[PDB]
Structure formats: structure tokens, C-alpha cells
Design a protein around this ligand. Structure first.
Ligand SMILES: NC(=O)[C@H]1CCCN(C(=O)Nc2ccccc2F)C1
Ligand SMILES: [Zn+2]
Length: 139
């Protein structure tokens, strides 16, 4: 679990979104595993606007933050789950690191702010849904 709170927006993994998220829906994209909902309270997270490929992510299954080198956002095949059939997920970045399903939602941050959130993993890899191209999150 985990979310990004920026301005009047809440960013979560689409496969983990609540009834409240869907009733206050702003935008959702199955191919990216992202959903953004509106909030009443104001968010203070800073979204990074950069091409960084190094950062730090939070891994809930280990109660630790890990430094990672990650790939540029791209289409990556993702195995079928209870939430999606097998498909290409777009805007995904991989890194070598520990992840378990419950780790989705953990933030990845670089020096410039929030990069994205854990969305996939397994086999010693961790995949992150990029949020840096979503320029409208800021205003
Ligand atoms: N974005 C997706 O399609 C994910 C939906 C939930 C399930 N997905 C997934 O990768 N599970 C998983 C398994 C082992 C280690 C880490 C993991 F995140 C895929
Ligand atoms: Zn950066």
C-alpha cells in the first residue's frame, strides 16, 4: 500500500484504489496501473521533473529504504494477476531489488522529489510506475 499526495490529488496503484478513489476519480489508466482521485485536504509532495535513473525507494516487506539504479520508462510485459490479464504495462521502470505484492505503493524518490511508486516485482527485480510526465499534477 501507499499513495502520493500533491495539491488536491491522491495518486495510487489503480489495482489498489478504494470506492472513495473511484467516486472522486480524476484520471485512470489500466495500461500504467495508475489512478488519481481528488482530496479535500492539501498535499505537499513535490513531483520530480527530470530524467534521473538513480534514487531511493521504500520497501514495506523489509521496513527499509534502498538505493537503486532504474531503467527509463518503457513498455514491459507483466504476468497475469487477479487484477489484470498478461499485458504490456507502459511508463514502467525496473531496478534490481527486493519487492513483494504488498510493496506496491511505496514511493521512489530522487534528489528532485517523487519519481513514482512500486507497481510490479519478483525474481529480484522491482518495477515502478513513473509519474514525472504527469505535468498537470502541479496545478
Ligand atoms: N502492475 C501489475 O500488473 C501488478 C499487479 C499486482 C501483482 N503484480 C506483481 O508484480 N506482483 C508481485 C509479485 C512479486 C513481487 C512483487 C510484486 F509486485 C503485478
Ligand atoms: Zn531527479
Amino acid at each position: 500500500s501507499g499513495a502520493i499526495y500533491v495539491g488536491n490529488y491522491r495518486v495510487v496503484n489503480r489495482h489498489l484504489a478504494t470506492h472513495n478513489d473511484w467516486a472522486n476519480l480524476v484520471w485512470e489508466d489500466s495500461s500504467r496501473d495508475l489512478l488519481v482521485s481528488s482530496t479535500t485536504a492539501q498535499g505537499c509532495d513535490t513531483i520530480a521533473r527530470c530524467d534521473c535513473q538513480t534514487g531511493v525507494y521504500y520497501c514495506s516487506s523489509r521496513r527499509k529504504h534502498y538505493p537503486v539504479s532504474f531503467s527509463k520508462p518503457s513498455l514491459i510485459f507483466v504476468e497475469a494477476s487477479e487484477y489484470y490479464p498478461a499485458r504490456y504495462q507502459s511508463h514502467l521502470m525496473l531496478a534490481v531489488g527486493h519487492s513483494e505484492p504488498g510493496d506496491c505503493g511505496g514511493i521512489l524518490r530522487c534528489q528532485h522529489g517523487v519519481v513514482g511508486i512500486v507497481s510490479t516485482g519478483g525474481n529480484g527485480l522491482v518495477g515502478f510506475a513513473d509519474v514525472r510526465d504527469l505535468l498537470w499534477l502541479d496545478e
